[PDB]
RNA sequence: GGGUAGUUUGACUGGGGCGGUCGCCUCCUAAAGAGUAACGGAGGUGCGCAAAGGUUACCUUAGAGUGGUUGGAAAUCACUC
């Protein structure tokens, strides 16, 4: 059995058809779809505190399911007293089935558990179908336990879509039921 | 141990002395082969690396614009040019 995420089932069985009708696309897979979700977290303070970076990496692992990579400093800078090549950030890429499952978990479970959650700004679009927005308190995810955290942390989420514009991606996200603050 | 004896204490230098300089590398002066002076005009150097070597395999920045918890012009990530 090729086990399939419920999001993938929902997409393939409805969303393709509604978007074809709604945007008069000539051929079927002109329809937008999702290629990757990038979860990033920038801990510049890790240059003092290694525990911060280790905790962030581990907590990302529990949140998603796959291990993270610690990015390095592209340039040595003094304003943040950064030496080139130091560990400064940590990111995870989600693709395919894991991507769909994570996005489902997020939208239905973790966005609800945010303090004063009143939707998400439906305008954080880079003009090319890529939607990036932040979450300040990782504790919204029930996966991580409260006691073991060493410092409350946030993280940025970027969703990359095959769409050529923002309208297409916003329509796809709305069909997915993404709680945009509107 | 200058009581006494034998000797040394450089050269370039727009006189000499003082000052500065003396090996080697990069560019201009140098007039489109090469070479070509000056106390002409600007820099570096008497090392480091057991990888920062060899080989195979796999990859590409910086900047401008746009969207994102710290994160601001600028830290990390996505996309366009």
From Swiss-Prot:
Superkingdom of source: Bacteria
Similarity section: Belongs to the universal ribosomal protein uL5 family.
Pfam families xref list: Ribosomal_L5, Ribosomal_L5_C
Keyword presence, tRNA-binding: yes
Gene: rplE
Keyword Oxidoreductase: no
Keyword annotations of the record: Ribonucleoprotein, Ribosomal protein, RNA-binding, rRNA-binding, tRNA-binding
Record's protein name: Large ribosomal subunit protein uL5
SUPFAM superfamilies in alphabetical order: RL5-like
Subunit structure as annotated in this protein's UniProt entry: Part of the 50S ribosomal subunit; part of the 5S rRNA/L5/L18/L25 subcomplex. Contacts the 5S rRNA and the P site tRNA. Forms a bridge to the 30S subunit in the 70S ribosome.
Function: This is one of the proteins that bind and probably mediate the attachment of the 5S RNA into the large ribosomal subunit, where it forms part of the central protuberance. In the 70S ribosome it contacts protein S13 of the 30S subunit (bridge B1b), connecting the 2 subunits; this bridge is implicated in subunit movement. Contacts the P site tRNA; the 5S rRNA and some of its associated proteins might help stabilize positioning of ribosome-bound tRNAs.
GO CC annotation terms, alphabetical: ribonucleoprotein complex; ribosome
């Amino acid at each position: 059995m090729n086990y399939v995420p419920e999001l993938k089932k929902y997409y393939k069985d409805s969303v393709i058809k509604e978007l074809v009708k709604e945007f008069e696309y000539k051929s079927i897979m002109q329809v937008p779809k999702l290629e990757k979700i990038v979860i990033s977290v920038g801990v510049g303070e890790a240059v003092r505190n290694k525990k911060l970076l280790d905790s962030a990496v581990l907590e990302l692992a529990q949140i998603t399911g796959q291990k993270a990579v610690k990015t390095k400093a592209k340039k040595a800078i003094a304003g943040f007293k950064i030496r080139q090549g130091q560990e400064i950030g940590a990111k995870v890429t989600l693709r395919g089935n894991a991507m769909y499952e994570f996005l489902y978990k997020l939208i239905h479970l973790a966005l609800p558990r945010v303090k004063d959650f009143r939707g998400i700004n439906g305008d954080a679009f880079d003009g090319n179908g890529n939607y990036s927005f932040g979450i300040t308190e990782q504790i919204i995810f029930s996966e991580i336990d409260y006691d073991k955290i060493e410092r409350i942390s946030g993280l940025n989420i970027t969703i990359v879509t095959t769409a050529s514009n923002d309208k297409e991606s916003k329509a796809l996200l709305l069909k997915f039921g993404m709680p945009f603050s509107n």
